[PDB]
Design a binder for this molecule. Structure first.
Ligand SMILES: Cc1ncc(C[n+]2csc(CCOP(=O)(O)OP(=O)(O)O)c2C)c(N)n1
Ligand code: SF4
Ligand code: SF4
Ligand code: SF4
Ligand SMILES: [Mg+2]
Lengths: 166, 1163
C-alpha cells in the first residue's frame, strides 16, 4: 500500500481495501504557486505528454511530472498497457492538467485542465483490473461501499480542477 | 595572525576556505558553524577558489546528507556541520559517501544522544554511532587543534578519497573561546593537492562522459566489490601522516596519528581522545615533575585505526594502561576505544594490563583531580576495570574515588569567575575582555561560559583564564584570583566565593555601603572575606547607569571595574581598548548613545570603592535557620540541590532508571524575578477573566469563594460580588502570584475595563502583602460552578494545568497550551516535539504540567524532533487498545452476578465509551460502585471486578495532543505529520507557529514569510510561507484551523473545541509571537491582533463534518482586513533590519493572493 493507492484498491497492508482516498501530491505542489505541476498519461494523450515534458524542462524552476504508469501489480493484460492508461483518463480515474507558473506572470491562469469531460464509466474501469475485482470477491457487501466512495471522490476531484480552470 | 575564536568559528574558518557548497540543518552546538559561514558568505568572503561559499539549508540533516552526496557526485567540494541526533540522520548517506570514495569533511561538535533524556551537551556518543560507516575520524582536543586538524581533514580527504568526520567536544571545545594562531586561506591553498581536486572533477556525473553509480548487486560480486576499497583505507594513515607534516612545516605544530606526552620511562599511561587530552597532559606535567612515571597517548586519527602508528609512540616501559571513553554502550563488554587498545595490544603480544573507563558524559566535568584518580587506579594492586570518573555510583560501584585535590594550573595563570544575570551583558563583556587581552598582550586567553535552562533571569557563570603559557585547562576554574558578582541577589543564594585564593579579589555590584555590609552579607561570606584577606570592592553600577541615562545596563560599567582592579594590563591601556570597543558596538547607535557609554567608563573608575572590613568578620557565626517546611522527597532531595547548583553531588541512586519525572514541580521554584507585578483594582474590574487567559505563566487567576470561606483572609484580600447567574452569592477576586509573575505586562494590556483594573507596581513594594494574598487564594477550597467552559470567562474558572514554566516573559506559546489543559487537561496525553515547547515544558528537574485536586493532569512525553507526529500516533493506538481491554472485562461483567446499578452503569459506559462526557459520567459511576461491588463478590467474579478496577484509568476517553513548533511541523517532521493526518486517527495537532526556530536562536523555517530576516536567510527569505493548513485541507477529512489568541478569543475557543470533538485528525496552527520577532513582549497579544488586521495571518476553520451536513467545510472567520500590511511589517525588527523594498512589495502581494484564495474556497 501507498498514499498514492486509490480508494477500494487491494494491496499488501490493505487487505480489506484502502479506505482513505489517494493523496493529491499535485494539489499540494501547486499551493506553492512557483512549481510547475503536470499530470500525464501516455496511453491517454501523446500530444499532452509532449506538452508537459517540454514546458517542465524549459521552466526555470522546480517541475513536477506525475505520470500514470500501468503495472503488473494492477492485474491487467500488459499487452494493452497503453490502452489501460487511456481508459483511466476517459473514466475520470486519472486527470490530465498542467500548472504553469509562467502563465501567472503573463496575467493568465496558470492551471490548464487538459481533459474536462469524461466519457467512460468509472466502475467499468475498476472492474477491468484485478486489484479492484479481488475486493468484490473478498467482501461483496463492503466492495459496493468502497467503489461508490471512489467514484464520488473522483467527481469531487474533477469538480475541483474545473473550478481552478474557471 | 592571532585571534580569539571558539572551536566552531575555528572549524568554520577552515571549512569555508576549502569548500564550494555547504548544505546544513541547525542543531546545537554545531549550528554556530553554519551561522557564521552564512554571515561570511553574506559579506562576500572568498574561499581558496575565489568564490563565496554557497550555504543551503535543508528540511533535516537527512536532507542535508543527501544533498552532500549529490553535490559530491556531481563535482563540487561539499561540507556540512552537524552533531548528535543530526549526525544519526546522516548515517545512511555516510555509508554511501564512503562507499563511493568521495572526498568530504563532516564537522561535528560532538554531543550526547537522546536516551533516557535529551542532552545538548558534549560527549562522543554521536561520533561513536557512526564509526562503522567507513568515514575516517579525526579528533581535535583544543581550539587550536580544531583550526589545525580541520585543515588536515580537508587536505587528507582529497588525497585519500576517504571522507572524514572531524569532531571536537561539544561546548567544552566548540564554545570555548581561545586565542589561537589562525591559518591564512592563502597558506591553505599552497598545501592543497590541486591534481587531486581535478581528478575529483573528472569522476563527476556529466552527460558528456557519463557513468552509472549506486547499482544494486547480487551475492556473486557484492563481497568482492566491497573489499576493492581496501587500498584506499590501507593508505589513509600514511596520507594523514604526510598531511600532518605539511601543516607542521607551515605552522610549527607537530601532530601525529597518535601523540605521546609524559615520562619517557612511564609505567602507567592513559589513552584518550578529544579535549580530555588537554586536561590529562596538564596533569601529566604536574605528576611527572613530582617524579611519577606516567604518560598519555592522544588519539587523533581514530578511524582508520593504524596499529603501526599507535605502537610507535607507546614507550616500552608501559606496564598498565587506562583507556578513557567519552561514551556509553550499555551491555557492551567495553567501550570502543578500550576495545581497540585491548585488541591491538593482543595482536602484537604486549603483556600490558589494560583497563577502560567512562568520563564526561553530557559535558560532565573532567578536571585534573579526576585524571589523578585514574592514574591512582592504575597504581592499585588490582585496578578496577569498567570504571567511571566524575560521578558517585553508589548502585553498581563503578566510580573511582577522588582521593585528593590537586592544582595543576600552570603558575602565572590569572583566573576569574563572573556571576551574571541572563542577558545583562556579562558574557558579552567577558568575550570582549578576552578579545582585548588577547589582541594587545602576549598572554594566552581562554573563556568558557556556563548557561542556565531558564531563558530569562537565569544564572550565567563566566570562566576566564590568562597566562604566559598555553592554556590546556579544559575544565571549570577551581581557584580564582578574582570573583565578580554582577547581581546582588546572588549574595546569600549561591556559593560565590568558592575556591577563591587567599588574597584574591571579590568585586560586587550592589547599593550597599561598607556599614550595611555587616547586615547584608551572610556570615559564611564574611568569614571567607576576612580569613582569606580578600580585596573587597563594591560598585553601585545601577546608580551610574540611571544617572547617565543608560537605564539599568551595567555591562560597560562592570567591565570597566574589572580591568581597574585585575592588574592584568595597564589601566590606561584598558580604558582605551574599552572605548575603542564602545565605538565598534555603539558607533551606529548615535552620538548621544556613544558619549553615555563613554561616561559609563569614566564614572565607573571613580565609583569603585574598596570595603575596609573588620578582622572580626572571620569569627562571624551563621544565623539560626528558620523551621523549614516539610517538602516532598523529590523537591527536597533532587530539585533543591540542582537549583542550588549542586546537582553534580547527587549520586546515581538519586535518579530513576528511565528518566521519569513527577509533575507539578515548578510551583516550588518561586523565582520572584519580576520587577513589576499587576495590582488588581476591584472597583474597575468587570470580571471577564481575560487577564487569566493571556498570562504565559498562569501567575494571575480568578478565585471564587463562598463568604464563609473568606474567614481567615488577610485584611488586604479585598473581594467583590460575583457577576453572573452561575456564581450568585459568591465572592470574586483576581489574584496574582507575585513570586511566579514575570512582569511581562500582558494582563494589564488585555484588561478591557474603562479604567485599567491592573496596574504595574514594583514587586519589592507589594511583595510582602501579595504573598499573603496569594497564599490565601491558593488554599481556598474548590467551588462547584456551572460556568460554560466554551466561553473565555467560563474556561478561566477551570484550573490551569500548565503553570510557572521557564518560557520567556510574554511568550506567545504557553497561553495556547494552558488553555488546552483548562478544556481537556483532565484526560489528555501530550506528545511534544523538541523545541521551545519541550524546553519550557520539560527541562529537568521541574515540570510545569501539574494536576488538579483529584490528582489528574496531562501526561507528558517528548521523543525526538523528527518523530513527534508518529510518536503521538503510537500513543493513540495504545490508548485504544487499553480501552478495548477494559471494554472486554466490562462486557463480561454483564454476564456476572453483580448489582443492577453496576450493570446499568456498565451498559451506559459501553454505549458511550467513545464520547468524552458520557465516558466520564458512567466511568465515574463505575468507580463509585467498585469498592462496594468487590466486597460483595468472591471467587472468579471478584477477580473480574478486580480486573475492572485495575483498568479504571481508561474509563474516561483520552485526548491525544501532538504539540510542536513550526520547524517540526513544516520541516523535519512534516513527512511524519502528513502521514498521521492522512491516517485519520483521532489526534489533535497543535502547531505553535513562531515562523522561526525559536529555541535555537531564530533560524529560518518554511513557516517564515517573505522578506523576514532570520538565520540562514541573512538577506531576507525570498520564497513565501508554505501553507501547511492548505495542504492538510487537500485530504478533506482533516480538521484544519488557523487561530491567533491576540486577534480573536472567541475564534480560538471555537476552533479548539471543534478540533477536539472531531472524530478524526485535527490541525491547529496557532500564531505564537516570540522574542525573535523584535517586538515589545508587553504587547504580545496586541501584535497578534495587528497580524490578522493587516492580512499577515489568516483566521479560518475547515470542518469536515459540515460537508456531511451539506454545508461548505471552509469558513473564513476574518474576510476583510482593516489595517495596512506594510505597517505591520514595520512593527517588528525582523523586517526593519532589511532596510529591500522589493521584498516588502512581494510580501504584500502574497498576502492578498492568499486572502483572495480563501475567499474563493468560502464562496
Ligand atoms: C534531528 C534533530 N535536528 C536538529 C535538532 C535541534 N533542534 C531542536 S528544536 C529545533 C528547532 C525548534 O523549532 P520549532 O519546531 O519551530 O520550535 P520553537 O522553538 O520555535 O517553538 C532544533 C533546530 C534536534 N533536536 N534534532
Ligand atoms: S505580568 Fe505577565 S506573568 Fe505577571 S501575571 Fe500578568 S501576564 Fe502573568
Ligand atoms: S482583564 Fe481586567 S476586568 Fe477582566 S478580569 Fe482581569 S482585571 Fe478584571
Ligand atoms: S517561543 Fe519565544 S518567547 Fe516563548 S519561550 Fe521560546 S524563545 Fe521565549
Ligand atoms: Mg518556531
Amino acid at each position: 500500500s501507498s498514499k498514492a493507492t486509490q480508494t477500494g484498491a487491494v494491496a499488501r497492508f490493505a487487505a480489506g481495501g484502502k479506505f482513505t482516498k489517494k493523496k493529491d501530491l499535485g494539489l499540494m505542489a501547486m499551493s506553492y504557486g512557483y512549481v510547475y505541476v503536470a499530470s500525464v498519461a501516455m496511453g491517454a494523450s501523446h500530444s499532452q505528454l509532449m506538452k508537459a515534458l517540454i514546458e517542465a524542462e524549459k521552466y526555470d524552476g522546480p517541475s513536477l511530472i506525475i505520470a500514470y504508469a500501468p503495472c503488473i501489480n494492477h492485474g491487467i493484460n500488459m499487452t494493452y498497457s497503453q490502452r489501460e492508461a487511456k481508459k483511466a483518463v476517459e473514466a475520470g480515474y486519472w486527470p490530465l492538467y498542467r500548472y504553469n507558473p509562467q502563465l501567472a506572470q503573463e496575467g493568465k491562469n496558470p492551471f490548464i485542465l487538459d481533459y474536462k469531460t469524461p466519457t467512460a464509466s468509472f466502475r467499468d474501469f475498476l472492474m477491468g483490473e484485478i486489484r479492484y475485482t479481488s475486493l468484490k470477491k473478498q467482501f461483496p457487501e463492503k466492495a459496493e461501499q468502497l467503489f461508490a466512495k471512489a467514484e464520488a471522490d473522483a467527481k469531487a476531484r474533477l469538480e475541483q480542477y474545473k473550478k481552478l480552470a474557471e | 595572525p592571532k585571534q580569539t575564536l571558539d572551536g566552531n568559528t575555528a572549524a568554520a574558518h577552515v571549512a569555508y576556505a576549502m569548500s564550494e557548497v555547504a548544505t546544513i540543518y541547525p542543531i546545537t552546538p554545531s549550528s554556530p558553524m553554519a551561522e557564521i559561514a552564512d554571515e561570511w558568505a553574506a559579506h562576500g568572503r572568498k574561499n581558496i577558489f575565489g568564490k563565496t561559499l554557497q550555504v543551503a539549508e535543508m528540511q533535516s540533516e537527512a536532507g542535508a546528507a543527501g544533498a552532500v552526496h549529490g553535490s559530491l557526485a556531481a563535482g563540487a567540494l561539499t561540507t556540512t556541520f552537524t552533531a548528535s541526533q543530526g549526525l544519526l540522520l546522516m548515517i545512511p548517506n555516510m555509508y554511501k559517501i564512503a562507499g563511493e570514495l568521495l572526498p568530504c569533511v563532516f564537522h561535528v561538535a560532538a554531543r550526547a544522544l537522546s536516551t533516557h533524556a535529551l542532552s545538548i551537551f558534549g560527549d562522543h556518543a554521536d561520533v561513536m554511532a557512526a564509526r562503522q560507516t567507513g568515514f575516517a575520524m579525526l579528533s581535535s582536543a583544543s581550539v587550536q587543534e580544531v583550526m589545525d586538524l580541520a585543515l588536515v581533514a580537508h587536505l587528507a580527504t582529497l588525497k585519500a578519497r576517504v571522507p572524514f568526520v572531524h569532531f571536537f567536544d561539544g561546548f567544552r571545545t566548540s564554545h570555548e573561546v581561545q586565542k589561537i594562531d589562525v591559518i591564512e586561506y592563502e597558506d591553505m591553498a599552497k598545501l592543497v593537492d590541486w591534481d587531486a581536486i581535478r581528478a575529483f572533477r573528472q569522476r563527476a556525473l556529466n552527460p558528456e562522459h557519463p557513468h552509472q553509480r549506486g547499482t544494486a548487486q547480487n551475492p556473486d560480486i557484492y563481497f568482492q566489490s566491497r573489499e576493492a576499497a581496501n587500498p584506499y583505507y590501507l593508505a589513509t594513515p600514511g596520507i594523514v601522516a604526510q598531511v600532518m607534516e605539511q601543516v607542521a612545516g607551515l605552522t610549527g605544530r607537530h601532530y601525529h596519528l597518535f601523540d605521546y606526552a609524559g615520562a619517557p620511562d612511564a609505567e602507567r599511561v592513559i589513552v584518550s581522545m578529544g579535549s580530555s587530552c588537554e586536561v590529562i597532559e596538564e596533569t601529566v606535567n604536574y605528576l611527572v615533575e613530582k617524579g611519577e612515571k606516567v604518560g598519555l597517548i592522544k588519539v587523533r586519527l581514530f578511524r582508520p585505526f593504524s596499529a603501526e602508528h599507535f605502537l610507535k609512540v607507546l614507550p616500552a616501559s608501559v606496564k598498565r594502561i587506562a583507556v578513557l571513553d567519552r561514551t556509553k554502550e550499555p551491555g557492551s563488554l567495553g567501550e570502543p576505544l578500550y576495545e581497540d587498545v585491548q585488541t591491538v595490544l593482543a595482536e602484537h603480544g604486549k603483556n600490558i594490563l589494560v583497563v577502560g573507563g567512562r568520563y564526561g558524559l553530557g559535558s560532565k566535568e573532567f578536571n585534573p583531580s579526576m585524571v589523578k584518580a585514574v592514574f591512582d587506579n592504575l597504581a592499585a594492586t588490582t585496578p578496577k576495570n569498567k570504571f567511571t570518573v566524575g560521578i558517585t555510583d553508589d548502585v553498581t560501584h563503578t566510580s573511582l574515588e577522588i582521593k585528593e585535590h590537586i592544582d595543576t594550573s600552570p603558575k602565572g595563570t590569572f583566573r576569574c569567575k563572573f556571576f551574571g544575570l541572563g542577558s545583562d551583558g556579562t558574557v558579552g563583556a567577558n568575550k570582549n575582555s578576552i578579545k582585548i587581552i588577547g589582541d594587545h598582550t602576549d598572554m594566552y586567553a581562554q573563556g568558557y561560559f556556563v548557561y542556565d535552562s531558564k531563558k530569562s533571569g537565569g544564572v550565567t557563570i563566566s570562566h576566564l583564564r590568562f597566562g604566559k603559557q598555553p592554556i590546556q585547562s579544559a575544565y571549570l576554574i577551581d581557584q580564582a584570583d578574582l570573583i565578580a558578582c554582577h547581581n546582588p541577589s546572588y549574595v546569600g543564594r549561591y556559593n560565590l566565593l568558592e575556591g577563591i585564593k587567599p588574597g584574591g579579589i571579590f568585586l560586587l555590584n550592589s547599593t550597599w555601603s561598607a556599614e550595611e555590609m555587616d547586615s547584608r552579607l551572610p556570615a559564611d561570606m564574611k568569614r571567607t572575606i576576612a580569613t582569606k584577606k580578600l580585596k573587597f570592592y563594591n560598585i553601585d553600577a545601577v546608580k551610574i547607569a540611571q544617572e547617565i541615562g543608560l537605564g539599568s545596563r551595567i555591562n560597560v560599567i562592570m567591565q570597566t571595574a574589572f580591568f581597574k582592579i585585575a592588574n592584568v594590563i595597564p589601566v590606561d591601556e584598558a580604558i582605551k581598548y574599552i572605548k575603542d570597543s564602545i565605538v565598534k558596538t555603539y558607533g551606529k547607535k548615535g552620538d548621544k548613545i556613544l558619549n553615555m557609554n563613554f561616561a559609563a567608563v569614566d564614572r565607573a573608575l571613580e565609583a569603585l570603592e574598596e570595603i575596609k572590613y573588620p578582622a572580626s568578620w572571620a569569627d562571624a557565626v551563621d544565623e539560626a535557620a528558620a523551621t523549614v517546611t516539610e517538602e516532598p522527597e523529590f523537591i527536597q532531595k533532587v530539585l533543591r540541590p540542582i537549583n542550588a547548583l549542586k546537582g553534580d553531588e547527587l549520586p546515581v541512586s538519586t535518579f530513576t532508571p528511565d528518566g521519569v519525572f513527577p509533575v507539578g514541580t515548578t510551583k516550588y521554584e518561586k523565582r520572584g524575578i519580576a520587577v513589576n507585578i499587576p495590582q488588581w483594582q476591584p472597583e474597575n474590574c468587570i470580571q471577564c477573566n481575560q487577564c487569566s487567559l493571556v498570562c504565559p505563566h498562569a501567575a494571575i487567576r480568578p478565585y471564587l469563594a463562598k463568604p464563609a470561606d473568606l474567614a481567615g483572609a488577610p485584611e488586604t484580600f479585598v473581594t467583590k460580588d460575583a457577576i453572573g447567574k452561575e456564581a450568585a452569592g459568591l465572592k470574586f477576586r483576581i489574584q496574582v502570584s507575585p513570586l511566579d509573575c514575570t512582569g511581562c505586562g500582558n494582563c494589564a494590556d488585555v484588561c478591557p475595563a474603562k479604567v485599567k483594573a491592573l496596574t504595574m507596581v514594583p514587586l519589592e513594594e507589594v511583595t510582602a502583602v501579595e504573598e499573603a494574598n496569594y497564599n490565601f487564594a491558593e488554599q481556598l477550597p474548590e467551588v462547584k460552578v456551572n460556568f460554560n467552559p466554551a466561553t473565555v470567562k467560563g474556561s478561566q474558572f477551570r484550573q490551569p494545568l500548565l503553570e510557572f514554566s521557564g518560557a520567556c516573559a510574554g511568550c506567545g506559546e504557553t497561553p495556547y497550551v494552558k488553555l488546552v489543559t483548562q478544556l481537556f487537561g483532565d484526560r489528555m496525553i501530550i506528545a511534544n516535539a523538541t523545541g521551545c515547547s519541550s524546553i519550557w515544558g520539560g527541562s529537568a528537574p521541574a515540570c510545569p504540567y501539574t494536576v488538579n485536586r483529584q490528582g489528574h493532569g496531562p501526561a507528558w512525553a517528548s521523543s525526538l524532533f523528527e518523530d513527534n507526529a508518529e510518536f503521538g500516533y503510537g500513543m493513540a493506538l495504545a490508548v485504544a487498545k487499553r480501552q478495548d481491554e477494559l471494554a472486554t472485562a466490562i462486557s463480561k461483567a454483564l454476564e456476572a452476578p453483580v448489582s443492577a446499578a453496576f450493570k446499568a452503569a456498565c451498559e451506559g459506559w459501553l454505549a458511550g465509551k467513545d464520547d468524552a462526557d458520557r465516558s466520564r459520567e458512567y466511568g465515574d459511576r463505575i468507580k463509585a460502585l467498585l469498592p462496594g461491588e468487590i466486597s460483595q463478590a468472591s471467587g472468579e467474579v471478584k477477580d473480574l471486578l478486580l480486573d475492572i478496577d485495575r483498568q479504571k484509568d481508561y474509563l474516561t476517553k483520552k485526548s491525544i495532543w501532538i504539540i510542536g513548533g513550526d520547524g517540526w511541523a513544516y520541516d523535519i517532521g512534516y513527512g511524519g505529520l502528513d502521514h498521521v493526518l492522512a491516517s485519520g486517527a483521532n489526534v489533535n495537532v497543535l502547531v505553535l507557529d513562531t515562523e522561526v526556530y525559536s529555541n535555537t536562536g531564530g533560524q529560518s523555517s518554511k513557516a517564515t514569510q517573505t522578506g523576514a530576516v532570520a538565520r540562514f536567510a541573512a538577506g531576507g527569505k525570498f520564497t513565501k510561507k508554505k501553507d501547511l493548513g492548505l495542504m492538510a485541507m487537500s485530504y478533506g477529512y482533516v480538521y484544519v484551523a488557523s487561530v491567533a489568541m491576540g486577534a480573536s478569543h472567541s475564534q480560538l475557543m471555537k476552533a479548539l473545541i471543534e478540533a477536539e470533538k472531531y472524530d478524526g485528525p485535527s490541525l491547529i496552527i496557532a500564531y505564537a509571537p516570540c522574542i525573535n520577532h523584535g517586538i515589545n513582549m508587553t504587547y504580545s497579544q496586541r501584535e497578534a491582533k495587528k497580524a490578522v488586521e493587516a492580512g499577515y495571518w489568516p483566521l479560518y476553520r475547515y470542518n469536515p463534518q459540515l460537508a456531511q451536513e451539506g454545508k461548505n467545510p471552509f469558513i473564513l472567520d476574518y474576510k476583510t482586513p482593516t489595517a495596512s500590511f506594510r505597517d505591520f511589517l514595520m512593527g517588528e525588527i525582523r523586517y526593519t533590519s532589511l532596510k529591500a523594498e522589493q521584498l516588502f512589495a512581494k510580501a504584500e502581494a502574497d498576502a492578498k493572493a492568499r486572502l483572495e484564495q480563501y475567499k474563493k474556497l468560502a464562496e
